[PDB]
Swiss-Prot record, chains A, B:
Tissue expression: Preferentially expressed in lymphoid tissues. Expressed in bone marrow, thymus, spleen, lymph nodes and Peyer patches of gut. In the spleen and lymph nodes, expressed in both T- and B-cells. In the thymus, in the medulla and cortex.
Residue positions, PTM Phosphothreonine: T66
Signal peptide interval: none
Gene symbol of the encoding locus: Sash3
Domain SAM, chain residue ranges per copy: 2-64
Modified residues (Phosphoserine): C68
UniProt function note: May function as a signaling adapter protein in lymphocytes.
UniProt-recorded name of the protein: SAM and SH3 domain-containing protein 3
């Protein structure tokens, strides 16, 4: 159960890009839930499947931010 | 905010495979959180980025199942 941005990247297997997110202002799950593919374009994360993971993570974090059932 | 499997697939943009999950026994988020790439191999979801999304969704659903903060 990730509580921080870093942990979330570790969760999905993109901890290789934790710094990428972090440096681009994505320091929290609240930031990462705003992360989009168009943003990965900016972050220069052209890694296709890695993108797909990052986006999906952001998708779910936007709704599943542990805000109870 | 998806409460069901179908909605989750819609969330990540893999509603094309909702039936795939559903038919393979993934009818709930509780099922999908067990969804792995090796499973997509079985579901014949060789769609690389789609896989990546599906897996990430399963990753996050496993921890972020709206079980509060």
């Amino acid at each position: 159960g990730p509580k921080t941005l870093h942990e979330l990247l570790e969760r999905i297997g993109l901890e290789e890009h934790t710094s990428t997110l972090l440096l681009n202002g994505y320091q929290t799950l609240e930031d990462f839930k705003e992360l989009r593919e168009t943003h990965l374009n900016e972050l220069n994360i052209m890694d296709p499947q890695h993108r797909a993971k990052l986006l999906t993570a952001a998708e779910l974090l936007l709704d599943y931010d542990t805000g109870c059932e």
